[PDB]
Design a binder for this molecule. Structure first.
Ligand code: MET
Ligand code: MET
Ligand SMILES: [Zn+2]
Ligand SMILES: [Zn+2]
Lengths: 152, 151
């Protein structure tokens, strides 16, 4: 059957994390294209990101990717804690997305702090960690070569 | 200082959960609209949702809401665990959003299982709870008359 939600149609047991998958392409009535990418850090049901590191990598990448790209719509963590969804508008070169992510992960490692990590600009300012975030980004980076190998 | 990220520009110490807030807008070069809504379940830095309940609510609303619309681009949980982001395409009607969210939450209470809570369709299948999700859905619903008052 075809599920209502795109990711419910992905066989999680066959993908090989880490990877960047074209999860969805929507073209608006006016022709504008919206593309969604499943950037998986951990292997489904085999591992996951602890919330403090996940939460910080969200602030860091959300803020930084937008320095390297003018077409980012959103960067949101998955509830399953194994990855993030990246949404872009009017951009459709898979390779350029990997380079943008690459440049972005590199700047995460050179970070000296986690952006807007206080009670004025965050709903849980306490739950943060730059080290964990950076640990996640380095690990993701170390397998850059495998990014386009989704596995299924 | 204005951050690249729009929610970083929201003064979290002046909002009052629960609430549904028009958080962002973007328009393609061809005219297509994208509106993102900040739907806050918990008071910032004063409370938060536990992951299993949040995870289950992600699944439930994500499937249930698209049974009621056909313009939903995405239903995503926030890293801070206090709310979700609702993204829509070519739909600019705040009132309808509240009603759809009202209908969605009601169906969530009639749900018998968290959909797709298995290892083939979920990245952490064991981390779920239907009841937990239904408890967040009931609370959110009880305070319905407040949804439009963000400040
Ligand atoms: C709280 S970090 C910002 C997350 C949001 N989904 C965005 O990319 O704008
Ligand atoms: C894991 S439920 C799917 C969530 C995703 N943000 C969507 O709206 O499709
Ligand atoms: Zn935050
Ligand atoms: Zn899941």
């Amino acid at each position: 059957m075809k599920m209502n939600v795109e990711s419910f149609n992905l066989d999680h047991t066959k993908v090989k994390a880490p990877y960047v998958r074209i999860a969805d392409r929507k073209k608006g009535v006016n022709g504008d294209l919206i593309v969604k990418y499943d950037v998986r850090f951990k292997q489904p049901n085999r591992d996951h990101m602890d919330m403090p590191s996940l939460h910080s990598l969200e602030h860091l990448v959300a803020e930084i990717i937008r320095n390297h790209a003018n077409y980012v719509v959103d960067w949101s963590p998955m509830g399953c804690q194994t990855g993030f969804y990246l949404t872009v508008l009017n951009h459709d070169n898979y390779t350029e997305i990997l380079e943008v992510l690459e440049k972005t992960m590199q700047d995460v490692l050179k970070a000296k702090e986690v952006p807007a990590s206080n009670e004025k600009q965050c709903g849980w300012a306490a739950n943060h960690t730059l080290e964990g975030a950076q640990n996640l980004a380095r690990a993701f980076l170390d397998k850059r070569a495998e990014w386009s190998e989704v596995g299924v």
